[PDB]
Design a protein around this nucleic acid. Structure first.
Ligand SMILES: [Mg+2]
Ligand SMILES: [Zn+2]
Ligand SMILES: [Zn+2]
Lengths: 293, 1099, 147, 93, 155, 129, 95
DNA sequence: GCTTGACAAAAGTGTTAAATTGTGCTATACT
């Protein structure tokens, strides 16, 4: 085992000296911001109090060195200096963690990367996205398999930049500023326009949790009255969708490639069989059984 | 029943309540009255029990008195707590954002032992938050509830765990105090490698005493025989280095270490619970630490009886931490006491040290006393503590169960993640104390529960349940409240066992519960106590489910949870088929207006109701009108009485939000048809008659609160004003002088509510902007527009306005000149996408609403209101919902006997006076004695007419419905009836969200989630998996770059859509750039290399 | 009836001094009004009552060309301090029209829009009886109206 | 920390309309005399972004500051003329 | 494994896994299970170097072990390892970091001075590249489209 | 663990494979599961009855008809292509992977079958008691 | 660029750390308690990390995009986009 | 189509007073 570390340093050009720090980097300020909330009260990152202990103790150390001081005092400073840089990098990894008011430990640099709330899982492997919405879902029994009911208010916001262009093309609005107000106030002209842009323009529907890829499927949006989402009754199986009040997210593919992938790869009617057993999924169930039986 | 104005609701109960339901808000008021120790609690503990009642406040004050330094030269003594009248009224506090509190006063006596002088001074501790009649607190204006916590009572508890290796038996005992280090068998302070013998000598007992006291214990001798410690002081040294490693000891420190750790009262806290637990089961006494080890050795040996060497005999047996005899339940008074104790001990520190550096004879009770830490404990307890919660009120029932909730989480208890499923399972001792059927569905299951109906809390913190003691096969009127310990002592007869004449056992044998608890069948001979009634185990909400006994515990739990989820309707109709509790749950909730003296009504206005008592006194009650509740429901009250009316004490003068004529109405009675209908009601969906819209039967109001303040800014003062820098006079059309929306106005999404302005500069306007200014002559204004507008997707009428100005005396935090709150309200018609449900756990969204023209409609031409799918019913074990659907039809249409000549066989067991009820009469089937299947059928045939003598439903509860679409009948008979369905607090208006562009996060440029921020949807790890399985690379890239994190690409894509150009190529996600920076800050050198040229720079 | 105006109140959610019913519970009551009008064009009715008593639809004074067909209907109960001054606007149409918000119409802050039910008919059913071979069909329809 | 908006973040609809405004001005300016448009640009610093004083614009065209002040007033009443201004109105803010 | 050899462990593991799912009534085609089982057998323990460049007790990829072991003109045994330990052995260091034990991974990566080629799809997700699967594969994304001269004629 | 496994090529050409049981011992009776084992695969070598006639050639899809046809000839096992034996340098090969359960045809060359396998396995996990 | 090939790690040496740094932050100071402006030489110092406002130095002598990439001889702040405040690092020299 | 001189506002510029900020110190004895 001990060889694995000693060998690693030979092949690389890394000086093992790197494991001791003469200098500590300082992260840019906007990544550890200090800002005033609405009302003027201030909030800042824990990183700054952590950086503050380090620099406080380093500066005191300089002071004691210059006066001359018994090792007891000086060595005490160096021990404190060591612990503060520990807390900065990884807090609580040794000893009790540095805490703030209410005794809650401060978040270290390591605390950024790690965990479900760290950068990787929170901000990297997933994230929040533009051009998306959600609502509660209701049954679609009159829909064709490739279609979905989309709340017209929801459709309007989702497609807002598209219609804004369209109603400037048609002369409804003279400039983009006027187009934006026309959509916000929901002046009646926009609806006919919405149906234009939404035509044959697909959208992805997702219900959490997403277990198999069939948990996202593309459909053909249909403007619908009401604030709910009309879901075709044959896709419940794949989404595991209960109408007990489940909600579903809508996503608007933008680029030509994204729309192609929606129509070809993810379209509802092209995904019927489960891609595990090959058995049919969209096959009738419940009511539709007893009706045909 | 027994309530003066109680409406007439006939019951099928075949038993008689021997005991009225206790006041079910009591658990909160008693705990608090003990803490403050008002005379109401004084009389209680004087007229029974101990003769020296000590209030919680005095109790913690005894612990402090006196304060004496090591010298004992000065002593600061406390005594005699006092409260003044409450500062402001509850109504005033909720308005002014203050906390409902009484100032507390204390007598502080400081004595100088050298000079023998006394200084007595009255001291102000602080404003001590008080408890409302309703059992709540007003903390900074918001009504809050202190939930009671479940904890392990102090005591000695033994556990037998089979060896993971040898399989041999082991104990394994533990002793948990009020405070101080804990010991386990001597493994102490989490220090292993400690023989239990080495300490027995540390007290100074010589080995012969071990051989004398150990006696029959073989491993007791072998442990001292193996232990190498020679001498009592040498063993203290082997204990000293394991307990205090790093410190070289002293004979003064070696001896006092053990003495100070436990025996000393300051460091080790004897609990009244712990003191009582072990004193009977066997501060800390040396006598007690010997009996501990003695109990243990006589456990692993297998003997059931230990007679102490000088003590009294008790069973030697294992203990169960989940048995309620060992589990409290710290109530609100105590949760406050503990937080006060902490505040005082932090002050004692400043009182002790203060004495030293203060010039003597210049010290007074005040100069030593600094009250900062005492009030901070209270304020910091109500805020930020998990046991102090914002009261849950969308309906009276939700509020009533929030109090009465007991949870095992919080400080002083286990964390939600660590505790295993053994604590979540229901114990046999929960019977009649904690309702098993009610808990959360989330991963709080079993950690949160509600106190049972007849359950009552002990002064020591153990729950008691009422019982009626039986003697010689005869059940007396004696009612004795027993704890879990004394219930294991006896045999509890089943609540319903046949009654004999003047009363006695009729049935040959008796249903009984043993101490297992293990059920058994024995004759009337051996019983002691019997159950006070069915539904002792049940809670209030659970007791409100008609035909509870027919529904699986799964769907019942859901049913209870969803009742507290309902929302008050404008009309508030009461349940056609009810249970017992509806009456008494609404009055005890406090959301209904009750008269406290018999008399007559002088005036009835929508605003208030006055009654002239027979006493000559005059009582009046101001009505809550369209008051916004915590979560936005409506608290509106309505008077149910008329001017001339006579009234009696405890009657119901006015209805609350969900109540009708005194009983809880959480929903409406609707005409239900259980056929599947054209694939619309499917997979739990529901369809509705448009009637429920036109007639506003499911309609409910909602009120939102909006807030803005004008503060002092470094660049000036913010000013509320009607002048906005750039607007049309149209947007301002609804603003008054000051710039706040006018009462009665209609407001859409983005409309202005309160205009506000803040200074700005130096501006540096863009050249293109400065040119238009010259052309159109509009001076660039000195200040930015920061103004209050209504959130996206909201709307309503402006109800009321509240303005707090610094110019006006008012009051406000430093910097805030003016505060204006605007209250918007809206009528919400029942809408497709809203969630409805019944009391049985049956829930679903509204999938469609049809014109009353085309709906299944009865032969009368009477359309059905709801069509419920047949398929969801059979598999869910909720079939109680079908029963009440039948009874619902009965209660609506009335009925007759069944006589003459005689009464039929089924009615013999027996409906009494129930033989006839008119149309629309309301029914009550208490849970565990309700109507019975036989009695339903007999009633199912009854009674015409619609109007004409024809009957609309058969003895099967079915009818022939005509399709309102084709006009032809439906081939088969369909079940119809009336069901009680509730409107639930999940609404489409609140749950529909959409975003194109919006605010982005500061550190990461991602859109920020939640409706408040106008946020976007999270595309998560699992969603990306699905995307990858499809093989859509461009879709996946898009979501993760130009739709979230790409700061240049997201503005370009917009630019492209608006110009109809092609969507551009994506860039680098900002979050990744951030990651590199965060790794650099760890001294990780991360370089992004190309094929070459080596390092690329992110910039 | 389309809208209503009450002097004292600027909106639906307040009370009136001395009146037992809040304005919203009064609007609910006024829903049960069954009126009839020659129309065309909107016409305002008027109601004013003082002193104790009980207000009902009979107390509504209709203009020329309209009538109230169930004056027996309870509106609000007033006491010594109760005074109720309210005008009502009757329009003509069919079906159910949800209250038209005065932001969409040209109304000012005072007008209370209300849901309007124009449905003369109350409850309707039918049945048929054939006319054996040669059977024909004869149907009876049961029509009820609100008066 | 993740509930905090970024107030300096670029808003796509404004930057695009600002691009569109920058287009309409370039056009409206083309309806002015070469020197009339040239004086407005330098006066407000359209091209450079750095505004210029009347004396400085007089230095490029070889006139007094007062002459430039005059030419400024005229082209502004020309710009205020409705046919030129009608299109820029919706850009008020 | 040591008794019946690498290919037999696979047969066993698929049977065992497939038995649990069969018990509960679930139908999974064996290939899906096989895809997963294939990833447990992909490495071998290095007993001797001998002139490598590899270290005893280390787990190295079978293909990477075979090629460099040739060295023109170093013995190991088949190794079974669980899915978690297997994924940590992956050559992508930022893929391993995002998975689990982030601190352990970053510290070993910085000492070994590890270079990540960004071949795998999780890596490309993190940096915003086009995953090398489905439409992102080279052969598909480099497709060139033009209308036939026959089509342009008809216009 | 499986996310990087995608179909990289049509055929690795190996003759290696795994032996599917395809019932046995009757009548004197398909294996309970040939649907998740033998079906959807592709033959590694020719399936030959005694003595015999080669009833199905290597590379056949092995649909429902093929199992009936084979079963008649009395073949109690078949050697099948699997991703376990696939020799592809990177990823796996379509022929070895076999039919796509979704399309019902030979897997496409882009398919990422690791993720699909991961999900196909984990999804039912909720139903595993 | 959006296409890079390798991404590498290694131990950052004190010299690497010093080369990244745009200055040594010498004070444990965030922002002034009155003006709320970044304190010089502290955390947030504009001299090292960057300008708070686009092409605006701390004092303001050079306020314009006309000269990007020049440093103010008074406050020592560089005239450029405030975005660099997100990209730039400091260091501490330990005693 | 443009320029001149009188002129006042606006903008810098240097000079001074006020405020703000930093540091040293306090001697019964006290560990
Ligand atoms: Mg669900
Ligand atoms: Zn292959
Ligand atoms: Zn400067």
């Amino acid at each position: 085992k001990r060889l694995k570390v000693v060998a690693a340093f030979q092949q690389s050009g890394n000086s093992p000296m790197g494991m001791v720090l003469d200098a500590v980097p300082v992260i840019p300020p906007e990544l550890r911001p200090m800002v005033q909330l609405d009302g003027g009260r201030f909030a800042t990152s824990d990183l700054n109090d952590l950086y503050r202990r380090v620099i406080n103790r380093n500066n005191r150390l300089k002071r004691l060195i210059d006066l001359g001081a018994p090792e007891i005092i000086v060595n005490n400073e160096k021990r404190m200096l060591q612990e503060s840089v520990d807390a900065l990098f990884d807090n609580g990894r040794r000893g009790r963690p540095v805490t703030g008011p209410g005794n809650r430990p401060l978040k270290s640099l390591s605390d950024l990367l790690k965990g479900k709330q760290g950068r990787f899982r929170q901000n990297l492997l997933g994230k929040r996205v533009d051009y998306s919405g959600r609502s509660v879902i209701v049954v679609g029994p009159q829909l064709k398999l490739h279609q979905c009911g989309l709340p017209k208010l929801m459709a309007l916001e989702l497609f807002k930049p598209f219609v804004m262009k369209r109603l400037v093309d048609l002369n409804h609005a003279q400039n983009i500023k006027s187009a934006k107000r026309m959509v916000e106030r929901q002046r009646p002209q926009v609806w006919d326009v919405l149906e234009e842009v939404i035509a044959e323009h697909p959208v992805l529907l997702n219900r959490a949790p997403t277990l198999h890829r069939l948990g996202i499927q593309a459909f053909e949006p249909q403007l619908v009255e009401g604030k709910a989402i009309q879901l075709h009754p044959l896709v419940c199986e794949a989404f595991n969708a209960d109408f007990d009040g489940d909600q579903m997210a809508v996503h608007l593919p933008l680029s030509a490639e994204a729309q192609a992938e929606a129509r070809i790869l993810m379209l509802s009617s092209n995904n019927i069989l489960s891609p595990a057993s090959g058995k049919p999924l969209a096959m009738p169930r419940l009511d539709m059984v007893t009706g045909l039986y | 029943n027994s309530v003066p104005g109680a409406p007439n609701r006939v019951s099928f109960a075949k038993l008689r309540e021997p005991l009225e339901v206790p006041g079910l808000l009591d658990v909160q008021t008693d705990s608090f009255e003990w803490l403050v120790g008002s005379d109401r609690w004084r009389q209680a503990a004087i007229d029974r029990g101990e003769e020296n009642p000590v209030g919680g406040l005095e109790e913690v004050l005894a612990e402090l008195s006196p304060i004496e330094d090591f010298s004992g030269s000065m002593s600061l003594s406390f005594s005699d707590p006092r409260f003044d009248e409450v500062k402001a009224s509850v109504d005033e506090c909720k308005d002014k954002d203050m906390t409902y509190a009484a100032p507390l006063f204390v007598t502080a006596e400081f004595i100088n032992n050298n000079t023998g002088e006394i200084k007595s001074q009255t001291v102000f501790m602080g404003d001590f938050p008080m408890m409302t009649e309703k059992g709540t607190f007003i903390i900074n204006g918001t009504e809050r509830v202190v939930v009671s916590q479940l904890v392990r009572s102090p005591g000695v508890y033994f556990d037998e765990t089979i060896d993971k290796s040898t399989e041999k038996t082991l104990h394994s005992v533990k002793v948990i105090p009020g405070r101080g280090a804990w010991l386990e068998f001597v493994r102490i302070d989490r220090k292993r490698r400690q023989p239990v013998t080495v300490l027995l000598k540390a007290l100074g007992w010589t080995n012969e005493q071990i051989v004398e006291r150990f006696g029959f214990s073989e491993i007791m001798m072998g442990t001292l025989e193996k232990d190498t410690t020679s001498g009592t002081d040498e063993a203290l040294l082997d204990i000293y280095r394991k307990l205090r490693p790093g410190e070289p000891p002293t004979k003064e420190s070696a001896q006092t270490l053990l003495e100070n750790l436990f025996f000393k009262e300051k460091r080790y806290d004897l609990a009244r619970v712990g003191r009582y637990k072990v004193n009977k089961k066997l501060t800390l006494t040396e006598e007690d630490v010997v009996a501990t080890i003695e109990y243990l050795v006589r456990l692993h040996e297998g003997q059931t009886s230990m007679t102490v060497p000088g003590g009294v005999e008790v069973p030697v047996e294992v203990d169960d931490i989940d048995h309620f005899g060992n589990r409290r339940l710290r109530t609100v008074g105590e949760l406050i006491q503990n937080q006060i104790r902490v505040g005082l001990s932090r002050m004692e520190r400043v009182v002790r040290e203060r004495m030293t550096t203060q010039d003597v004879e210049a010290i007074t009770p005040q100069t030593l006393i600094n009250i900062r830490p005492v009030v901070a404990a209270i304020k910091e307890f109500f805020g930020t503590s998990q046991l102090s919660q914002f009261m849950d009120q969308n309906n009276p029932l939700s509020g009533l169960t929030h109090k009465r909730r007991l949870s095992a989480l919080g400080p002083g208890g286990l964390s939600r993640e660590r505790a295993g499923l053994e604590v979540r399972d229901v114990h046999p001792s929960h019977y009649g104390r904690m309702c098993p059927i009610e808990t959360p569905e989330g991963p709080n299951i079993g950690l949160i529960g509600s106190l049972s109906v007849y359950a009552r809390v002990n002064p020591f913190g153990f729950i008691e349940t009422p019982y009626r003691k039986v003697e010689n096969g005869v059940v007396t009127d004696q009612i004795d409240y027993l704890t879990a310990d004394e219930e294991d002592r006896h045999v509890v007869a089943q609540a319903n066992s046949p009654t004999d004449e003047n009363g006695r056992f009729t049935e040959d044998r008796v249903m009984v519960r043993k101490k297992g608890g293990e059920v058994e069948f024995v004759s009337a001979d051996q019983v002691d106590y019997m159950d006070v009634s069915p539904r002792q185990m049940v809670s209030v909400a659970t007791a409100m489910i008609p035909f509870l006994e027919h529904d699986d515990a799964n769907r019942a739990l859901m049913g209870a949870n969803m009742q507290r989820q309902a929302v008050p309707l404008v009309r508030s109709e009461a349940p056609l088929v009810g249970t017992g509790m509806e009456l008494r749950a609404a009055i005890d909730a406090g959301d209904v207006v009750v008269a406290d003296k018999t008399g007559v009504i002088e005036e009835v206005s929508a605003d208030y109701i006055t009654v002239m008592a027979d006493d000559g006194t005059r009582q009046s009650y101001r009505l809550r009108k369209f008051a916004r509740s915590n979560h936005g429901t409506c608290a509106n009250q309505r008077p149910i009485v008329d001017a001339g009316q006579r009234v009696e004490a405890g009657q119901v003068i006015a209805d609350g939000p969900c109540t009708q004529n005194g009983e809880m109405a959480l929903g409406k009675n609707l005409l239900v048809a259980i056929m599947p209908w054209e694939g619309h009601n499917y997979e739990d969906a529901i369809i509705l008659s448009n009637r429920l819209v036109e007639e506003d039967v499911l309609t409910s109001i909602h009120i939102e609160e909006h807030e803005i303040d004008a503060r002092d800014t470094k660049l000036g003062a913010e000013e509320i004003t009607r002048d906005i820098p750039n607007v049309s006079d149209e947007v301002l059309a609804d603003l008054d002088e000051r710039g706040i929306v006018r009462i009665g106005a209609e407001v859409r999404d983005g409309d202005i509510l309160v205009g506000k302005v803040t200074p700005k500069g130096e501006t540096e306007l863009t050249p293109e902007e400065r040119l238009l200014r010259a052309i159109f002559g509009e001076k660039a204004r000195e200040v930015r527009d920061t103004s209050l507008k209504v959130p996206h997707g909201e709307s309503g009428k402006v109800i009321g306005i509240r303005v707090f100005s610094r110019e006006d005396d008012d009051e406000l935090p430093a910097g805030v000149n003016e505060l204006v709150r605007v209250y918007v309200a809206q009528k919400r018609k029942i809408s497709d996408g809203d969630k409805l449900a019944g009391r049985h756990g049956n829930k679903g969204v509204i999938g469609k609403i049809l014109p009353v023209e085309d709906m299944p409609f009865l032969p009368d031409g009477t359309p059905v209101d709801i069509i419920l799918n047949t398929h969801g019913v059979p598999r869910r074990m909720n079939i109680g919902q079908i029963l009440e659907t039948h009874l619902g039809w009965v209660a609506k249409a009335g009925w007759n006997i069944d006589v003459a000549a005689g009464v039929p066989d089924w009615a013999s067991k027996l409906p009494e006076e129930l033989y006839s009820a008119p149309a629309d009469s309301t029914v009550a089937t208490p849970v565990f004695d309700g109507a019975q299947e036989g009695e339903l059928a007999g009633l199912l045939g009854s009674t015409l007419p619609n109007r004409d003598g024809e009957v609309m439903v058969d003895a099967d509860g079915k009818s022939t419905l005509f399709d309102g679409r084709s006009g032809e009948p439906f081939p088969y008979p369909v079940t119809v009836g009336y069901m009680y369905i509730l409107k639930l607090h999940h609404l489409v208006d609140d749950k529909i969200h959409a975003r194109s562009t919006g605010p982005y996060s500061m550190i990461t440029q991602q859109p920020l989630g939640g409706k408040a921020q106008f946020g976007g949807q999270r595309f998560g790890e699992m969603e990306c998996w699905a995307m990858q399985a499809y093989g859509a690379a461009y879709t996946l890239q898009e979501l993760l770059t130009i739709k979230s994190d790409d700061t240049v690409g997201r503005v370009k894509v917009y630019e492209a859509i608006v110009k109809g150009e092609n969507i551009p190529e994506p860039g680098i996600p900002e979050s990744f750039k951030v990651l590199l920076k965060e790794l650099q800050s760890l001294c990780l050198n991360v370089e992004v290399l190309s094929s070459d040229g080596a390092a690329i720079e992110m910039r | 009836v389309t809208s209503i105006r009450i002097d004292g109140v600027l909106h639906e959610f307040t009370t009136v001094p001395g009146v037992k019913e809040d304005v919203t519970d009064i609007i609910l009551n006024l829903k049960g009004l069954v009126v009839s009008s020659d129309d065309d064009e909107p016409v305002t009715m008027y109601l004013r009552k003082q002193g104790p008593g009980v207000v009902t639809a009979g107390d509504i004074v209709p203009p020329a060309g309209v009538t109230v067909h169930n004056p027996d209907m309870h509106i609000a109960t007033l006491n010594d301090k109760g005074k109720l001054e309210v005008e009502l606007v009757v329009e003509r149409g069919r079906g159910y029209v949800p209250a038209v918000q005065n932001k969409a119409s040209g109304a000012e802050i005072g007008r209370i829009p209300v849901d309007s039910i124009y449905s003369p008919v109350l409850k309707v059913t039918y049945k048929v009886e054939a006319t054996q071979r040669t059977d024909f069909d004869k149907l009876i329809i049961d029509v009820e109206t609100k008066n | 920390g993740d509930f905090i908006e970024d107030s300096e973040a670029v808003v796509a609809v404004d930057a695009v309309s600002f691009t569109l405004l920058q287009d309409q001005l370039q056009s409206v300016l083309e309806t002015l005399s070469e020197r009339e448009a040239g004086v407005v640009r330098l006066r407000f610093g359209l091209t450079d972004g750095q505004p210029r004083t009347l004396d400085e614009i007089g230095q490029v065209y070889g006139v007094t500051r007062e002459r430039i002040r005059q030419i400024e007033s005229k082209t502004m009443s020309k710009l205020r003329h409705p046919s030129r201004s009608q299109v820029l109105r919706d850009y008020l803010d | 494994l040591r008794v019946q050899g690498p290919r037999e462990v696979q047969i066993h593991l698929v049977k065992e896994v497939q038995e649990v799912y069969r018990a509960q009534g679930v139908s999974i085609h064996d290939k899906h299970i096989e895809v997963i089982v294939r990833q447990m057998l992909r490495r071998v323990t290095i007993i001797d170097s001998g002139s490598t460049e590899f270290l005893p007790g280390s787990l190295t990829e079978r293909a990477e072990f075979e090629a460099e072991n040739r060295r023109v003109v170093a013995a190991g045994r088949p190794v079974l390892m669980g899915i978690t330990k297997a994924s940590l052995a992956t050559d992508s260091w930022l893929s391993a970091a995002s998975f689990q034990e982030t601190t352990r991974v970053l510290t070993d990566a910085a000492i070994n001075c590890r270079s990540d080629k960004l071949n795998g799809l999780k890596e490309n997700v993190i940096i915003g590249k086009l995953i090398p699967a489905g439409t992102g594969i080279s052969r598909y994304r480099n497709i060139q489209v033009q209308p036939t001269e026959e089509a342009r004629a008809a216009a | 663990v499986s996310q990087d496994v995608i179909v990289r090529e049509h055929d690795c050409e190996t003759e290696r494979g795994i032996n599917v049981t395809l019932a046995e011992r009757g009548p004197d009776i398909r294996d309970a599961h040939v649907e998740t084992s033998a079906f959807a695969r592709t033959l590694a070598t020719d399936a030959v009855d005694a003595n015999g006639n080669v009833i199905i050639e290597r590379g056949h899809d092995l649909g429902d008809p093929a199992i009936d046809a084979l079963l008649a000839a009395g073949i109690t096992t078949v050697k099948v292509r699997s991703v376990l034996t696939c020799t592809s340098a990177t990823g796996v090969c379509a022929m070895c992977y076999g039919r796509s359960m979704a399309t019902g045809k030979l897997v496409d060359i882009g398919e990422a079958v690791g993720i699909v396998a991961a999900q196909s396995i984990g999804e039912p996990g909720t139903q595993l008691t | 660029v959006n296409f890079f090939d390798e991404l590498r790690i290694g131990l950052a040496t004190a010299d690497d750390i010093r080369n990244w740094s745009y200055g040594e932050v010498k004070k444990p100071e965030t922002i002034n308690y009155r003006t709320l402006k970044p304190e010089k030489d502290g955390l947030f110092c504009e001299k090292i990390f960057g300008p708070t406002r686009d092409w605006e130095c701390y004092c303001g002598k050079y306020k314009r995009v006309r000269f990007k990439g020049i440093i103010c001889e008074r406050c020592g702040v560089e005239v450029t986009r405030a975005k660099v405040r997100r990209e730039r690092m400091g260091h501490i020299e330990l005693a």
